[PDB]
Amino acid sequence: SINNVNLADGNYVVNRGDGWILSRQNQNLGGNISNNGCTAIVGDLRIRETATPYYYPTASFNEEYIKNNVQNVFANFTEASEIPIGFEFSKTAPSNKSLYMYLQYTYIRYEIIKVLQNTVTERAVLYVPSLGYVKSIEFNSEEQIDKNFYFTSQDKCILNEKFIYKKIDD
Amino acid sequence: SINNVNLADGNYVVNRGDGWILSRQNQNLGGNISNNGCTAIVGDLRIRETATPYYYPTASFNEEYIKNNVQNVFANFTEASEIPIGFEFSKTAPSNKSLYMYLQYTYIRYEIIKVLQNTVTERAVLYVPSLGYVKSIEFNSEEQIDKNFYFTSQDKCILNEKFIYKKIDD
Amino acid sequence: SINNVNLADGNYVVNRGDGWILSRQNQNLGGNISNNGCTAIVGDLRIRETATPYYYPTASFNEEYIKNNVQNVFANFTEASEIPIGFEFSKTAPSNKSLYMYLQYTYIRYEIIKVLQNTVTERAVLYVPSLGYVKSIEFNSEEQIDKNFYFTSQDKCILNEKFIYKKIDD
Amino acid sequence: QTILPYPNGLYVINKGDGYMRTNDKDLIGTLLIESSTSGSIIQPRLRNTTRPLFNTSNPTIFSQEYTEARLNDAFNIQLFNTSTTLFKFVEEAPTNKNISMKVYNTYEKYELINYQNGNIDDKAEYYLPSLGKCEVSDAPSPQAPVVETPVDQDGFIQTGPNENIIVGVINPSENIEEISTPIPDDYTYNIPTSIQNNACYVLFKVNTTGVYKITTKNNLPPLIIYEAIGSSNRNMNSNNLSNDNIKAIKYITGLNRSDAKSYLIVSLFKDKNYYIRIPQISSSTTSQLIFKRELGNISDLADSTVNILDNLNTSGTHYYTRQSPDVGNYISYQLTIPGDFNNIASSIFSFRTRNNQGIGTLYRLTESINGYNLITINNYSDLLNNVEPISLLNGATYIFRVKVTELNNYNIIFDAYRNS
Amino acid sequence: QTILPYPNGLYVINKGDGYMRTNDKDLIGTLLIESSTSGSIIQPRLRNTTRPLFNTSNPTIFSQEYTEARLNDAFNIQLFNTSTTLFKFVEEAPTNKNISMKVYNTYEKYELINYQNGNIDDKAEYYLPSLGKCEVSDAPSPQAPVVETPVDQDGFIQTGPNENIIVGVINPSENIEEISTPIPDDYTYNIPTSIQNNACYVLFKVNTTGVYKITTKNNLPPLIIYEAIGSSNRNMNSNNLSNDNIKAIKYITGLNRSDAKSYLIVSLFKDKNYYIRIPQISSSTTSQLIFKRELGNISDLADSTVNILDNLNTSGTHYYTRQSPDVGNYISYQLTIPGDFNNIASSIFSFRTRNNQGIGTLYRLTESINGYNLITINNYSDLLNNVEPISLLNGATYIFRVKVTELNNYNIIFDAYRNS
Amino acid sequence: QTILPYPNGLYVINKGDGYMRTNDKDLIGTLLIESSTSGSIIQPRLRNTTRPLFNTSNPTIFSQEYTEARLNDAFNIQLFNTSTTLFKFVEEAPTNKNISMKVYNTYEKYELINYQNGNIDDKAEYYLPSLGKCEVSDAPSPQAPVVETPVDQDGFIQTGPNENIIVGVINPSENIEEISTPIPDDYTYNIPTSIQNNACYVLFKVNTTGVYKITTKNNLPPLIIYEAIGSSNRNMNSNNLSNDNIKAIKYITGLNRSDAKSYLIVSLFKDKNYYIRIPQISSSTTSQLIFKRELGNISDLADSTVNILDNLNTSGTHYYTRQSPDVGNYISYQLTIPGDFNNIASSIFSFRTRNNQGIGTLYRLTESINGYNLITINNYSDLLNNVEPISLLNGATYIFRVKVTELNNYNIIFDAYRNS
Ligand SMILES: CC(=O)N[C@H]1[C@H]([C@H](O)[C@H](O)CO)O[C@@](OC[C@H]2O[C@@H](O[C@H]3[C@H](O)[C@@H](O)[C@H](O)O[C@@H]3CO)[C@H](O)[C@@H](O)[C@H]2O)(C(=O)O)C[C@@H]1O
Ligand SMILES: CC(=O)N[C@H]1[C@H]([C@H](O)[C@H](O)CO)O[C@@](OC[C@H]2O[C@@H](O[C@H]3[C@H](O)[C@@H](O)[C@H](O)O[C@@H]3CO)[C@H](O)[C@@H](O)[C@H]2O)(C(=O)O)C[C@@H]1O
Ligand SMILES: CC(=O)N[C@H]1[C@H]([C@H](O)[C@H](O)CO)O[C@@](OC[C@H]2O[C@@H](O[C@H]3[C@H](O)[C@@H](O)[C@H](O)O[C@@H]3CO)[C@H](O)[C@@H](O)[C@H]2O)(C(=O)O)C[C@@H]1O
- Using DSSP's 3-state secondary structure scheme, residue C69 falls into helix
CB of E237 closer than 8 Å to CB of E275? no
- Which residue type, as a one-letter code, is found at position D39? G
Q: Is A169 exposed, middle or buried (0-12, 13-18, 19+ CB in 10 A)?
A: exposed
DSSP state of F361: E
Rounded Cα–Cα distance for residues B100 and B112 (Å):
38
Q: Is D394 exposed, middle or buried (0-12, 13-18, 19+ CB in 10 A)?
A: middle
Q: What are the start-end ranges of the E strands in F279-345? A: 287-294, 304-308, 319-323, 330-336
Listed residue (E347, E352, E340) closest to E387, CA to CA? E352
Any idea what the CATH number is for the domain that residue D301 is in? 2.60.120.1080
Let me know the angle formed at the C-alpha of E164 by E162 and E166, rounded to the nearest 5 degrees: 170
DSSP per residue over F24-46, as a string? Answer: TTTEEEEEEE-TT-EEEEEE--S
- Which residue type, as a one-letter code, is found at position C76? N
Listed residue (C116, C124, C146, C152) closest to C68, CA to CA? C124
Give the other-Cβ count within 10 Å of B8's Cβ: 9
Q: Does residue D200 sit within a domain?
A: yes
Q: Does residue D4 sit within a domain?
A: yes
Q: B44 vs D165: CB contact, 8 Å cut-off? A: no
Any idea what the CATH number is for the domain that residue E414 is in? 2.60.120.1090
CA-nearest residue of chain F to A13? F151
Give the other-Cβ count within 10 Å of F80's Cβ: 18
Instruction: Give how far Cα E289 sits from Cα of A38, E208, E215, E269, E282, Å.
Output: 59, 18, 6, 19, 16
Listed residue (D164, D156, D153) closest to D111, CA to CA? D164
Write out the H or E segment, with its range, that includes residue B123: strand B120-139
Q: Does residue F44 sit within a domain?
A: yes
- Cα dihedral A106, A108, A114, A119 in deg (nearest 10): 70
- Using DSSP's 3-state secondary structure scheme, residue A144 falls into coil
The separation between the first and the last C-alpha atoms of chain C, rounded to the nearest angstrom, is 29
Same domain, E303 and E316: no
Q: Among E140, E167, E200, give the residue marking a domain's end.
A: E140
- Which residue type, as a one-letter code, is found at position E119? N
Write out the H or E segment, with its range, that includes residue A35: strand A31-35
Same domain, D94 and D109: yes
Neighbouring-strand partners of residue E183: E206
CB of E15 closer than 8 Å to CB of A27? no
Instruction: Give how far Cα C25 sits from Cα of B125, F167, F274, Å.
Output: 61, 12, 20
CB of A133 closer than 8 Å to CB of A158? yes
Rounded Cα–Cα distance for residues F129 and E366 (Å):
75
Same domain, F88 and F206: no
Q: Among F281, F310, F339, give the residue marking a domain's end.
A: F310
Same domain, F9 and F84: yes
Listed residue (D340, D360, D341, D363) closest to D352, CA to CA? D360
CB of D268 closer than 8 Å to CB of D212? yes
Rounded Cα–Cα distance for residues D86 and D131 (Å):
8
- Which residue type, as a one-letter code, is found at position E47? R
Same domain, D233 and D176: yes
> Which residues, at least 6 apart from D330, have a Cβ–Cβ distance to it below 8 Å?
D253, D301, D303, D304, D401, D402, D403, D404
Q: Before E221, cis peptide (omega within 30)?
A: yes
In this complex, which of E87, E130, E235 lies closest to A123 when CB atoms are compared? E235
Same domain, D370 and D292: no
- Which residue type, as a one-letter code, is found at position E233? N
Q: Is B156 exposed, middle or buried (0-12, 13-18, 19+ CB in 10 A)?
A: middle
**Strand-strand pairing, F53-56 and F9-14:** unpaired
Q: Which residues of F touch A75 (CB under 8 A)?
A: 23-27
Q: Is C11 on the interface with D (CB under 8 A)?
A: no
Q: Is E218 exposed, middle or buried (0-12, 13-18, 19+ CB in 10 A)?
A: exposed
Rounded Cα–Cα distance for residues D201 and C67 (Å):
53
Question: Which residue segment(s) compose the domain that C32 sits in?
Answer: 1-170
Q: Does residue F191 sit within a domain?
A: yes
CB of D205 closer than 8 Å to CB of D270? yes
Instruction: Report phi then psi at E241, rounded to 5.
Output: -85, 120
CB of E406 closer than 8 Å to CB of E358? yes
Listed residue (E257, E262, E27) closest to E135, CA to CA? E27
Same domain, F60 and F135: yes
Instruction: Give how far Cα C26 sits from Cα of B24, C156, D182, F74, Å.
Output: 51, 12, 75, 12
Query: In chain E, how many H helices and how many E strands?
Result: 1, 32
CB of A149 closer than 8 Å to CB of A118? no
Rounded Cα–Cα distance for residues D70 and D170 (Å):
9
> Which residues, at least 6 apart from F60, have a Cβ–Cβ distance to it below 8 Å?
none
Rounded Cα–Cα distance for residues F292 and F214 (Å):
6
Any idea what the CATH number is for the domain that residue D60 is in? 2.170.15.20
Q: Does residue E258 sit within a domain?
A: yes
Rounded Cα–Cα distance for residues F46 and F33 (Å):
25
Listed residue (B54, B8, B17) closest to B169, CA to CA? B8
Instruction: Report phi then psi at A95, rounded to 5.
Output: -30, -65
Buried residues in E35-63 as b, exposed as e (16+ CB within 10 A): eebbbbbbbebeebebeebeebeeeeebe
Neighbouring-strand partners of residue E14: E110, E165
Chain C contact probe: residue of D20, D37, D138 with most C CBs at under 10 A: D37
Same domain, D13 and D118: yes
- Which residue type, as a one-letter code, is found at position E420? S
- Which residue type, as a one-letter code, is found at position B11? N
- Which residue type, as a one-letter code, is found at position E418? R
**Strand-strand pairing, D274-278 and D224-228:** antiparallel
Distance from the Cα of C80 to chain F's closest Cα (Å) equals: 18
Q: Does residue E154 sit within a domain?
A: no
- Which residue type, as a one-letter code, is found at position E201? Y
Listed residue (C129, B87, D49) closest to E37, CA to CA? B87
Q: Does residue F333 sit within a domain?
A: yes
DSSP state of B163: -
Rounded Cα–Cα distance for residues A32 and A134 (Å):
10
> Which residues, at least 6 apart from C128, have a Cβ–Cβ distance to it below 8 Å?
C53, C70, C75, C77, C107, C108, C110
Same domain, D373 and D415: yes
Q: Does residue F416 sit within a domain?
A: yes
Same domain, F330 and F297: no
Any idea what the CATH number is for the domain that residue A132 is in? 2.170.15.20
Listed residue (D389, D223, D250, D415) closest to D306, CA to CA? D223
> Which residues, at least 6 apart from F65, have a Cβ–Cβ distance to it below 8 Å?
none
Rounded Cα–Cα distance for residues E413 and E380 (Å):
16
CB of E75 closer than 8 Å to CB of E249? no
**Residue of D218, D224, D259 to test ligand 1 pocket, by largest number of atoms within 8 Å of CB:** D259
Same domain, E298 and E416: no
The total number of structural domains that make up chain F: 3
Write out the H or E segment, with its range, that includes residue E309: none
**Strand-strand pairing, F165-169 and F27-33:** unpaired
Instruction: Report phi then psi at A59, rounded to 5.
Output: -60, -45
Touching subunits for chain D (3+ Cβ pairs under 8 A): B, C
Whether chain F lies against chain C with 3 or more Cβ pairs closer than 8 A is yes
**Strand-strand pairing, B164-167 and E149-150:** parallel
> Which residues, at least 6 apart from D288, have a Cβ–Cβ distance to it below 8 Å?
D188, D189, D190, D191, D216, D217
> Which residues, at least 6 apart from E216, have a Cβ–Cβ distance to it below 8 Å?
E223, E287, E288, E289, E290
Rounded Cα–Cα distance for residues E38 and B89 (Å):
5
- Using DSSP's 3-state secondary structure scheme, residue F70 falls into helix
Listed residue (F291, F302, F294, F268) closest to F372, CA to CA? F294
Q: B30 vs D83: CB contact, 8 Å cut-off? A: yes
CA-nearest residue of chain A to F105? A80
Question: Which residue segment(s) compose the domain that D258 sits in?
Answer: 159-310
**Strand-strand pairing, A164-167 and F149-150:** parallel
Cα of D338 to ligand 1 centre, how many Å?
Answer: 20
> Which residues, at least 6 apart from D60, have a Cβ–Cβ distance to it below 8 Å?
none
Cα of E320 to ligand 2 centre, how many Å?
Answer: 7
Q: Is D4 exposed, middle or buried (0-12, 13-18, 19+ CB in 10 A)?
A: middle
Q: Is C113 exposed, middle or buried (0-12, 13-18, 19+ CB in 10 A)?
A: buried
CA-nearest residue of chain D to B60? D237
Q: E32 vs B19: CB contact, 8 Å cut-off? A: yes
Q: Is the CB of D418 under 6 A from ligand 1?
A: no
CB of F145 closer than 8 Å to CB of A162? no
Q: What is the CA radius of gyration of chain F?
A: 28
Q: What is the CA radius of gyration of chain A?
A: 19
Q: Is D294 exposed, middle or buried (0-12, 13-18, 19+ CB in 10 A)?
A: middle
- Which residue type, as a one-letter code, is found at position C98? S
Pick left, alpha or beta for residue C142 (phi over 0 → left; psi -120 to 50 → alpha; otherwise beta).
Answer: alpha
Rounded Cα–Cα distance for residues F414 and F401 (Å):
11
The total number of structural domains that make up chain C: 1
Q: Which residues of B touch D84 (CB under 8 A)?
A: 44-45, 47, 50
Cα of E218 to ligand 2 centre, how many Å?
Answer: 18
Q: Is F316 exposed, middle or buried (0-12, 13-18, 19+ CB in 10 A)?
A: exposed
DSSP state of B93: P
Q: Which of residues 131-160 of F touch C (CB under 8 A)?
A: 131-137, 158-160
Q: Which of residues 24-43 of F touch A (CB under 8 A)?
A: 24-34, 36-43
Q: What are the start-end ranges of the E strands in chain C? A: 10-21, 31-35, 39-45, 54-56, 86-92, 98-115, 120-139, 156-157, 164-167
Rounded Cα–Cα distance for residues E14 and E167 (Å):
8
**Strand-strand pairing, A86-92 and F38-43:** antiparallel
Rounded Cα–Cα distance for residues F407 and F5 (Å):
8
DSSP state of F56: E
Instruction: Give how far Cα E26 sits from Cα of B65, B76, D195, E129, Å.
Output: 22, 9, 54, 11
Same domain, F290 and F337: no
Give the per-residue SS3 of E254-281. ECCCCCCCEEEEEEECCCCCEEEEECCC
**Residue of D224, D320, D353 to test ligand 1 pocket, by largest number of atoms within 8 Å of CB:** D320
Q: Tell me the technique behind this structure.
A: X-ray
CB of A18 closer than 8 Å to CB of E119? no
Rounded Cα–Cα distance for residues E322 and E326 (Å):
12
Rounded Cα–Cα distance for residues A126 and A119 (Å):
20
Write out the H or E segment, with its range, that includes residue D366: strand D357-368
Rounded Cα–Cα distance for residues F231 and F200 (Å):
20
Sign of CA dihedral E315, E316, E321, E327: positive
> Which residues, at least 6 apart from F126, have a Cβ–Cβ distance to it below 8 Å?
F52, F53, F54, F64, F67, F68, F71, F109, F110, F111, F112
